[PDB]
């Protein structure tokens, strides 16, 4: 080479990163249009004002070993998504209810997994009237990215984001924070609590409700996996209205009155549930999810309060579409109807 090596040649890893084939460099270019840098900003914005924290910056670079119209999406180094995106062309997507077909590459949308076909420019308005939904090239890469952020939002929430959320709270209600951390709760513990909440799709906008439940129940309990289910009920009115809007009936999934005892028998017994039970649940749990799909009902499971911290810990690494709530989290002012059931068949 020409210039001598300095420590500025050390490229620290990126929390979030994109790699780009040379055909896409225009849409990600500082200097030219930047048609996708705009979309990445409005993702990160409509995530802070929505999920309750700022996703880390998306470091975009190119990699000439990538096919020309291809991108990779990266977390802490390791790929977590890739796809094709063709600039001058558009993406006709089918929600299931479009009439006809179109000429072009047949493919599947990288977000929703829907069936979709890349089409050329002048088919736009003609593809829409057949019942399609046509997004720009740049918008597909946006779609794929806003999906993976919501999917990994727990892992993207590092100690550096906890300390940054803790500064943003501690500039609108400083009295809570000034003595809650590092005094009564340690940032390690506050961070693990918010991360547990993000992990189950519960937003952390209500830091009053959180930092108060913690400042109250902390000096007699320090396990974050225990302080979490306490905070969960503080946010019960909000978790309720999340999967069950309006004031109408609550269509939940239920487990058998003895299956409960079956599982509840295996709780206090030790740090382990027994094998054979497993594969039975996951098939039986997926039986209940399907009934709700054809009914038009949410995918929420309502269980005993000591039975939630592990059904969500077990069932969701397999069925992440599942919600696992608690009798003590659901509001009193609602009517419940166990529409589907997890029994012995």
Q: What is the 3-state secondary structure (H, E, C) of 30-78?
A: CCCCCCCHHHHHHHHHHHHHHHCCCCCCEEEEECCCCCCCEEEEEECCE
Residue 232: Cβ-neighbour burial (10 angstroms; 0-12, 13-18, 19+):
buried
In this structure, how many other beta carbons lie within 10 angstroms of the beta carbon of residue 274?
A: 9
Q: Is there a contact between 200 and 225 (Cβ–Cβ < 8 Å)?
A: no
Q: Which two tokens stand for residue 196?
A: 């547990």
- C-alpha dihedral (305, 314, 213, 55), degrees to nearest 10: -150
- Burial call 290-314: b when 16+ CB within 10 Å, e when fewer: eebeeeebbbbbbbbeebbbebbeb
In this structure, how many other beta carbons lie within 10 angstroms of the beta carbon of residue 137?
A: 22
Give the whole-angstrom CA distance, residue 309 versus residue 303: 10
Please report, for residues 37, 82, 119, 199, the alpha-carbon distance to residue 134 in angstroms, rounded to integers and kept in the order given: 20, 20, 9, 32
Give the whole-angstrom CA distance, residue 179 versus residue 49: 26
Which residue matches tokens 């409509």? 46
| Strand-strand pairing, 115-119 and 105-108 | antiparallel
| CA-based nearest residue to 79, from 12, 148, 25 | 148
In this structure, how many other beta carbons lie within 10 angstroms of the beta carbon of residue 90?
A: 23
Q: Which two tokens stand for residue 205?
A: 């906008």
Which method, experimentally, gave rise to this model?
X-ray
| CA-based nearest residue to 19, from 74, 84, 75, 88 | 74
DSSP letter at 100 equals S
Query: Domains, the chain, ranges and CATH?
Result: 14-157 (3.40.30.60), 158-341 (no CATH)
| CA-based nearest residue to 58, from 31, 86, 82, 39 | 39
Cα 289 off chain centre by: 19
Q: Is there a contact between 14 and 74 (Cβ–Cβ < 8 Å)?
A: yes
Residue 261 CB partners (closer than 8 Å, separation 6+): none
Q: Provide Rg for the chain, Cα atoms.
A: 24
| Strand-strand pairing, 58-62 and 16-20 | parallel
Give the whole-angstrom CA distance, residue 61 versus residue 25: 9
Q: What share of the chain is helix, strand, coil (3-state, %, to 5)?
A: 45, 15, 40
In this structure, how many other beta carbons lie within 10 angstroms of the beta carbon of residue 31?
A: 6
Give the whole-angstrom CA distance, residue 85 versus residue 65: 16
Residue 190 CB partners (closer than 8 Å, separation 6+): 162, 166, 180, 181, 214
Half-sphere exposure of 296 (CA within 13 A, CB side): 0
The three-point CA angle 334-248-341 to 5° equals 70
Give the whole-angstrom CA distance, residue 207 versus residue 194: 10
Q: Is there a contact between 232 and 239 (Cβ–Cβ < 8 Å)?
A: yes
**DSSP for 171-201, written as a single string:** TTSHHHHHHIIIIIS-HHHHHHHHHHHHHTT
Resolution reading in Å: 3.3
- Burial call 169-204: b when 16+ CB within 10 Å, e when fewer: bbeeeeebbeebbeeebeeebbbbbbbbbbbbebbb
């Amino acid at each position: 080479s020409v210039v001598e090596a300095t420590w500025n040649d050390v490229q620290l890893e990126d929390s979030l990163g994109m790699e780009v084939g040379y055909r896409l460099i225009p849409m990600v270019d500082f200097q030219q249009d930047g048609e996708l840098l705009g979309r990445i900003r409005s993702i990160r914005k409509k995530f802070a004002q929505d999920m309750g924290f700022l996703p880390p910056v998306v470091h975009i670079r190119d990699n000439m070993d990538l096919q020309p119209a291809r991108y990779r999406i990266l977390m802490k180094g390791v790929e977590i998504g890739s796809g094709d995106a063709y600039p001058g062309r558009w993406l006709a997507i089918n929600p299931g209810t479009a009439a006809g077909t179109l000429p072009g590459e047949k493919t599947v949308d990288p977000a929703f997994g829907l069936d979709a076909i890349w089409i050329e420019s002048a088919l736009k308005e003609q593809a829409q009237i057949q019942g399609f939904t046509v997004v720009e090239a740049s918008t597909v890469v946006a779609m794929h990215l806003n999906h993976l952020i919501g999917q990994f939002s727990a892992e993207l929430f590092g100690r550096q984001e906890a300390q940054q959320l803790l500064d943003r709270v501690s500039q609108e209600m400083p009295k809570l924070t000034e003595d809650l951390v590092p005094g009564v709760v340690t940032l390690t513990t506050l961070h693990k609590v918010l991360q547990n909440l993000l992990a189950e799709k519960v937003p952390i906008r209500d830091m009053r409700t959180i930092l108060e439940t913690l400042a109250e129940h902390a000096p007699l309990q320090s396990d974050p996996h225990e302080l979490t289910a306490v905070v969960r009920v503080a946010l019960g009115r909000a978790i309720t209205q999340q999967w069950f809007p309006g004031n109408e009936e609550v269509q939940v999934i239920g487990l058998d009155t003895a299956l409960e005892r079956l599982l509840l028998q295996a709780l206090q017994g030790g740090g382990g549930l027994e094998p054979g039970l497993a594969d039975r649940l996951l098939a039986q749990t997926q039986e209940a999810l399907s009934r709700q799909e054809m009914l038009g009902a949410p995918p929420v499971l309502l269980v005993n309060h000591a039975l939630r911290p592990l059904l969500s810990r077990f069932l969701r690494r397999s069925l992440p579409q599942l919600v696992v709530l608690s009798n003590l989290e659901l509001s009193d002012n609602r009517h419940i109807r166990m529409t589907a059931t997890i029994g012995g068949k």
